[PDB]
Structures are given as structure tokens and as C-alpha cells.
């Protein structure tokens with residue numbers, strides 16, 4: 001069970017978001033088609049970090065956090081009617097976003113589908 005993010009209630013999502021499709025994404029910075037994270041502020045789709053065991057992606061999502069400070073991202077492919085995998089870079093943990101349905105609706109994602 002994951003704790004509520006300090007960012008979840010007041011998260012600012014940028015105007016003119018993309019319509020994020022239900023499948024088929026790519027990292028906007030490399031050819032990764034798996035392990036992709038949607039930043040809930042700006043709708044960027046970027047790959048996951050390289051772990052110290054050498055597993056994972058090319059760090060594009062975490063590099064974008066370092067540049068923007070936009071702290072919440074959701075792992076694409078984990079969204080269900082029951083929730084999703086949400087990471088907070090600032091809190092450095094998996095978190096609960098009680099405003100997830102609103103935050104995903106901003107991108108045209110209906111988690112109930």
C-alpha cells in the first residue's frame with residue numbers, strides 16, 4: 001500500500017495536453033516501446049530508469065524530471081479501473097494519487113476503460 005503524494009491534490013497540469021492513446025507509445029527520445037512513463041504535468045512519454053543491476057530503460061523520464069521538476073509520472077500499461085503505478089521523483093517512492101482519474105482524464109484517458 002502506497003502513501004498519498006504531497007503533490008496529488010494541487011498538481012498543475014499544463015493546458016493543451018495531447019490525447020494519449022490506450023496503447024502503442026514510444027519514448028519521445030529513443031526507440032523504447034516498453035517501460036514508458038507519462039509525466040502527469042506535461043504528458044511527456046519517456047522511458048524508465050536504468051537500475052543498478054543494468055535492468056530498465058535509458059533514463060529519459062528521470063532526466064526530464066531533473067530538467068522540469070514535474071514530479072509525478074504514471075507507468076503506461078499499468079492503468080486499470082483499480083488504479084495505476086504512479087512514481088514521485090521528489091518523494092522518491094511509488095505513491096497514491098487520489099486525483100488519478102482527473103489527472104488521466106486531462107489526457108483523454110478513461111481508466112474505467
Ligand SMILES: O=C(O)CNC(=O)c1ccc(S(=O)(=O)N2CCC(c3ccc(Cl)cc3)CC2)cn1
Nearest residue numbers: 037047048049050051053055061062073087094
Ligand atoms: O523509471 C522512472 O523514470 C520512474 N520510476 C522510477 O524511477 C522507479 C524507481 C523505483 C521504483 S521501486 O522502488 O518500486 N522498485 C521497482 C522495482 C525495481 C527492481 C528492479 C529489478 C529487479 Cl530484479 C527487482 C526490482 C526496484 C525499485 C519504481 N519506479
Ligand SMILES: [Zn+2]
Nearest residue numbers: 027030047060
Ligand atoms: Zn528513452
